[PDB]
Amino acid sequence: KYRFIDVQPLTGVLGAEITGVDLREPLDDSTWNEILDAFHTYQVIYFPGQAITNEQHIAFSRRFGPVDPVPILKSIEGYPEVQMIRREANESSRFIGDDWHTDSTFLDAPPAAVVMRAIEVPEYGGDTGFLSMYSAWETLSPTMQATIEGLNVVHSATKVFGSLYQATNWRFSNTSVKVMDVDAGDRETVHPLVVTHPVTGRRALYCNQVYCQKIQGMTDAESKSLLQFLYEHATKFDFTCRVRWKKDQVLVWDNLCTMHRAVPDYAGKFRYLTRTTVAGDKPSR
Amino acid sequence: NKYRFIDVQPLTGVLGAEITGVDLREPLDDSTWNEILDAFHTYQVIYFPGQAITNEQHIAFSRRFGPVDPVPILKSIEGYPEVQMIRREANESSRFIGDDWHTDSTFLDAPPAAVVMRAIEVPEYGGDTGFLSMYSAWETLSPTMQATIEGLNVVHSATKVFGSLYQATNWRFSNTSVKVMDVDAGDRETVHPLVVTHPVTGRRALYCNQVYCQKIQGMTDAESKSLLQFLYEHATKFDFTCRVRWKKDQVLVWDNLCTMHRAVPDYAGKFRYLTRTTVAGDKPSR
Amino acid sequence: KYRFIDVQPLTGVLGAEITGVDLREPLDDSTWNEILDAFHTYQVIYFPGQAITNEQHIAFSRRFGPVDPVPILKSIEGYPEVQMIRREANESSRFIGDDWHTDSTFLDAPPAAVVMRAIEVPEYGGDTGFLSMYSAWETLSPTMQATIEGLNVVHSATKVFGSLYQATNWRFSNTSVKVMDVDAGDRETVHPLVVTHPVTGRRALYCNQVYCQKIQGMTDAESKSLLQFLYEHATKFDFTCRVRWKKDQVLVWDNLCTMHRAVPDYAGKFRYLTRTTVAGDKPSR
Amino acid sequence: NKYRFIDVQPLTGVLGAEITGVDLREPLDDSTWNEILDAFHTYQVIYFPGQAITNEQHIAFSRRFGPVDPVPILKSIEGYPEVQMIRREANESSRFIGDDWHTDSTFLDAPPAAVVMRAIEVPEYGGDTGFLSMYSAWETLSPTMQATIEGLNVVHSATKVFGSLYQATNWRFSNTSVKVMDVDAGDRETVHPLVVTHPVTGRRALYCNQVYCQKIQGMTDAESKSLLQFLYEHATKFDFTCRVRWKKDQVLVWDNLCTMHRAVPDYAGKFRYLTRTTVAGDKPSR
Ligand SMILES: C[C@@H](Oc1ccc(Oc2cnc3cc(Cl)ccc3n2)cc1)C(=O)O
Ligand SMILES: C[C@@H](Oc1ccc(Oc2cnc3cc(Cl)ccc3n2)cc1)C(=O)O
Ligand SMILES: C[C@@H](Oc1ccc(Oc2cnc3cc(Cl)ccc3n2)cc1)C(=O)O
Numbered sequence A, C: 001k002y003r004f005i006d007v008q009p010l011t012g013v014l015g016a017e018i019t020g021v022d023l024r025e026p027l028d029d030s031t032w033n034e035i036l037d038a039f040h041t042y043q044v045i046y047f048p049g050q051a052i053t054n055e056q057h058i059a060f061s062r063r064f065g066p067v068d069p070v071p072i073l074k075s076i077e078g079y080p081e082v083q084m085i086r087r088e089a090n091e092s093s094r095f096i097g098d099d100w101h102t103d104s105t106f107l108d109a110p111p112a113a114v115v116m117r118a119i120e121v122p123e124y125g126g127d128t129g130f131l132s133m134y135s136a137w138e139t140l141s142p143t144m145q146a147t148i149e150g151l152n153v154v155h156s157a158t159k160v161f162g163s164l165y166q167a168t169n170w171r172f173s174n175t176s177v178k179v180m181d182v183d184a185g186d187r188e189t190v191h192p193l194v195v196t197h198p199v200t201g202r203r204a205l206y207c208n209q210v211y212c213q214k215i216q217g218m219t220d221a222e223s224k225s226l227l228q229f230l231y232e233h234a235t236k237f238d239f240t241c242r243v244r245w246k247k248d249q250v251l252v253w254d255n256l257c258t259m260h261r262a263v264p265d266y267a268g269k270f271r272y273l274t275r276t277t278v279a280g281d282k283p284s285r
Numbered sequence B, D: 001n002k003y004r005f006i007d008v009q010p011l012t013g014v015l016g017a018e019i020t021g022v023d024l025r026e027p028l029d030d031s032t033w034n035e036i037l038d039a040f041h042t043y044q045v046i047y048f049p050g051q052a053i054t055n056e057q058h059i060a061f062s063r064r065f066g067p068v069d070p071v072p073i074l075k076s077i078e079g080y081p082e083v084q085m086i087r088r089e090a091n092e093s094s095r096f097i098g099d100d101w102h103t104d105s106t107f108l109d110a111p112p113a114a115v116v117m118r119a120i121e122v123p124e125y126g127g128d129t130g131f132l133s134m135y136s137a138w139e140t141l142s143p144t145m146q147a148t149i150e151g152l153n154v155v156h157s158a159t160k161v162f163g164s165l166y167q168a169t170n171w172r173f174s175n176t177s178v179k180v181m182d183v184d185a186g187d188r189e190t191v192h193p194l195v196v197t198h199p200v201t202g203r204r205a206l207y208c209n210q211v212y213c214q215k216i217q218g219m220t221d222a223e224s225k226s227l228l229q230f231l232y233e234h235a236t237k238f239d240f241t242c243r244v245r246w247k248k249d250q251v252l253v254w255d256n257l258c259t260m261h262r263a264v265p266d267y268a269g270k271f272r273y274l275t276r277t278t279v280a281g282d283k284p285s286r
């Protein structure tokens, strides 16, 4: 069915490799329409072998929507919108993003999408996992769905760069991570536990252990119990795929309907990807 | 306190009350009965020490609470089909009856409303019964959690007690107090709401128990297990419980809709014998 | 079998009422020997109807061992060793001791025992629960016992009056609780997970959720998992008893082989008991 | 890297490797075989894309790893009792074979040492197999936790797969690939250590799986459940896993002692067919 690009789905759940296109060149309307369709169908799409410039990265990201950096990451000099996920070979700090999450959900309007490009990565190690929150939602019984669909969740960055972060002893390195204001870390926002994607109209479960503090209105014990069940459910191996990186692979993921995590199995090896983030609207039900 | 015809001594700040100043061998005037019924509705489990009543007076007093109807599983005393036994011979090595939190016979389309239990001969110590309030278990859920669960129903059956799950496992009750039952009666399912309204007080109570509840209707096995596990942990917190110690001729009534109870098995090697008459109820409803 | 006192066990597991003795008077050797035997047998013993003076309380406690206040509680004026568990009718703060624990196990040598006396208590509400850690230990399989008997646990007061306490929003009232130094709150000690009682020689499980931070040498996830199973096991209703208070009831509990908790079911009612604490040796295996 | 006769491309930093530069239709010289065996021991699961071998060459290549012996439950291809099928017709609505973390046939006194699996016809996408390293699951337990558990043994049986627990439940495998089995063979127990030493590498591996492990020997049901649940959660973290995608004529070998695997059921409605020969092992030991 695709005529302007070649798409090879990665699993029966999510993920697709796209080839037959050169992202260094402008895309005609037909080629862009297929790309966007593949992005909305497969949720995480990746293009091996795209030796693009940083400006081309920026422009390509702009096709998905307004570009706008996430609060915590350092950017390359000359490009505030091009942020780094960079780990030096000798680092001993915590690996960025090494549990399931989606990005910056403590924001009133988290990103819609992220476009990541491998600069220099290990021959093996440092895969990124993804999973579908559409599948997590769809595999809940209708009874379970009706039960939880009216709930909201309180999100904040407290464990990442607020008071809880300051409490613990593990730190990120300053290679890619900025020093942040503690109160900014502890500012709370509220999102729906079940969101409707604004383009596809499909529903997705929307919670993550990194930023979700509690179910709004619940006791700590009620909220901890529901959220724990939902995390176990959503992170079943069945709902995941695994993306392996090579130099100049460019990947886009939908930040509303997927979760992702870094795999820290390359200790002692240099790894560097850049990324631009695409702004989103307020998550809504 | 407000009581003028009976003396009531509440047992904890959550449920339970001792009632004295009354002789259950004699008939009760309307004034004394109304206060007893009121104390039953206010305290959920009430008990009357020192009541040396006959089996017939036990039956008659039970009847004041509602029609009397034995539960399926228990043997009864000779000459009194309505008076059933909770009896454990000293030597027994079988499972102790009722030794986890439950309420009685909820596999029935219409479980009992109440039970009236009377001590015949019990150990100097050991063999207390614990009780907890399902009004309190419900009221301490957040308004959010209440709204979340109030439309759910739960499938109950006796499969673990005298159905296929019972037949599959190794432990048994002795035949001292427990009849042989049909396996299909054991496996027969009924559905009740997760949250019920008491037909007299109008108050709401959480309604689930691990002995007879199989699953939340319409949910997957893992969803149901996970929610019911949380509710069991919530309702069985020590703060919601009271503990009743038995003495010969103590007579006790519990509300079988808004409480749970469990036997404490801490008297192995000692004889224990209580009788009970069960008072019938209506379909639990929302 | 008791000839100098009358003892009435409370449950088949632990607990005993003692009568037939006047604690306002000196005890002969025979009466004291029976008291101590009952204390070692039943683990928590209580004497209704003992209108004693504070000095008599102190002296009676001294028969069990050296007396020595616990760090957190305020004492009555004129008697540093007589501490208060006092809640005013109008209080809205956290109830002292409202989860299962044993006292001050963050100390290198926690108390051996505590002697508590009711001054003024509600007609109903404010029971104290107790449970036996001998029974908790004895109902573990031999295989489970051999598995865990070599483990140690790190204890500290951090959740009660150290950094974790400072983090949260709930506070105890200053009615009975002193302001404490944070570092004193966070000082760690190490005890055996399975201790041998120094008088009876019987073994007891020794862990509590209030002061135990983690199994020494374990990861956070391993330790949280074992300790959770042990707490669920030890706090089964089967292992508990419940003590109801009346004015001038004097009770002694063994602080090594039991746990206890306050029951907060008297909101809006005044409740006041005093207590002296009896010093112990370093818990050992 | 150190390899001079084969090209090996590791799959993740934990386990798994692709091997190219070799034609399994031809015999392997000692030098090429030694490197393959070494890569098997180093990477635990290895796979060879593009190997259009006959069933006989499949059998012969398997044999290089150890004596070949079919597992009890799977049907075999006509004319090759040692070559068993993992085959799912497009229309099937039965349970997917192997769809949770396990290692093969651990109810046996001596489970297989390895399996060699070959894709005949598989979906364009969907039907990957996941693998994880039980060396890594063991090595990431603290020294304290290791000392704690290293003396324990676990009781295994096939009761959930083709024993009484299977017969009691509702789901079934189809008869496409699965034989009817004797219920008593299903319920027969064996005991293995919780922590095993690999008989060639000498390295230690955690050894438990939820499909066949019933309980820690000597423990109570609640103790065993609670410890095994923790170990399952620990060993199945995403960080310890790799995922293999299948293509026609890919041939893959896994170590059945130091890994676990699971089928991913994400291809309903599509035909999938792999064959496999199982290589026999010795009693797992400490
Ligand atoms: C860029 C990105 O920022 C991060 C940074 C790190 C991150 O990964 C984790 C994983 N586990 C964590 C666990 C704890 Cl207890 C605390 C913090 C944790 N952080 C997730 C998102 C974002 O969101 O845009
Ligand atoms: C009279 C009464 O009958 C019983 C009998 C026993 C009973 O107690 C338990 C407790 N835990 C159990 C656990 C399992 Cl796996 C099986 C059976 C169990 N039975 C609860 C009710 C009733 O309801 O009228
Ligand atoms: C006198 C006594 O001091 C206390 C004071 C309070 C206490 O009770 C609790 C119960 N649950 C708690 C829960 C949390 Cl998260 C924190 C603190 C908690 N404290 C236990 C012991 C002692 O030990 O001698």
Ligand SMILES: C[C@@H](Oc1ccc(Oc2cnc3cc(Cl)ccc3n2)cc1)C(=O)O
Pocket (backbone or CB within 6 Å): D071, D072, D073, D074, D097, D098, D099, D100, D102, D103, D104, D105, D106, D160, D161, D211
């Ligand atoms: C060939 C292989 O055979 C099987 C077949 C199926 C299998 O997969 C599962 C997964 N989860 C299961 C869960 C339950 Cl409750 C029951 C049976 C289950 N079976 C695991 C091994 C073997 O070992 O040789």
Ligand SMILES: O=C(O)CCC(=O)C(=O)O
Pocket (backbone or CB within 6 Å): A085, A096, A097, A098, A103, A126, A127, A128, A129, A260, A261, A262, A263, A275
């Ligand atoms: O390094 C990775 O694979 C992903 C890190 C991540 O979570 C992120 O960039 O937001």
Ligand SMILES: O=C(O)CCC(=O)C(=O)O
Pocket (backbone or CB within 6 Å): B086, B097, B098, B099, B104, B127, B128, B129, B130, B261, B262, B263, B264, B276
């Ligand atoms: O023996 C007891 O204390 C209670 C037994 C019980 O559960 C019952 O009679 O239903």
Ligand SMILES: O=C(O)CCC(=O)C(=O)O
Pocket (backbone or CB within 6 Å): C085, C096, C097, C098, C103, C126, C127, C128, C129, C260, C261, C262, C263, C275
């Ligand atoms: O108030 C109570 O019943 C007990 C409080 C307590 O834990 C203590 O005094 O140590």
Ligand SMILES: O=C(O)CCC(=O)C(=O)O
Pocket (backbone or CB within 6 Å): D086, D097, D098, D099, D104, D127, D128, D129, D130, D261, D262, D263, D264, D276
């Ligand atoms: O189908 C698969 O991917 C693996 C099935 C499996 O578990 C097995 O063959 O033992």
Ligand SMILES: [Cl-]
Pocket (backbone or CB within 6 Å): B063, B066, B067, B068, B069
């Ligand atoms: Cl009647």
Ligand SMILES: [Cl-]
Pocket (backbone or CB within 6 Å): D063, D066, D067, D068, D069
């Ligand atoms: Cl052979």
Ligand SMILES: [Co+2]
Pocket (backbone or CB within 6 Å): A097, A101, A102, A103, A260
């Ligand atoms: Co991220």
Ligand SMILES: [Co+2]
Pocket (backbone or CB within 6 Å): B098, B102, B103, B104, B261
């Ligand atoms: Co009962």
Ligand SMILES: [Co+2]
Pocket (backbone or CB within 6 Å): C097, C101, C102, C103, C260
């Ligand atoms: Co205390």
Ligand SMILES: [Co+2]
Pocket (backbone or CB within 6 Å): D098, D102, D103, D104, D261
């Ligand atoms: Co298998």
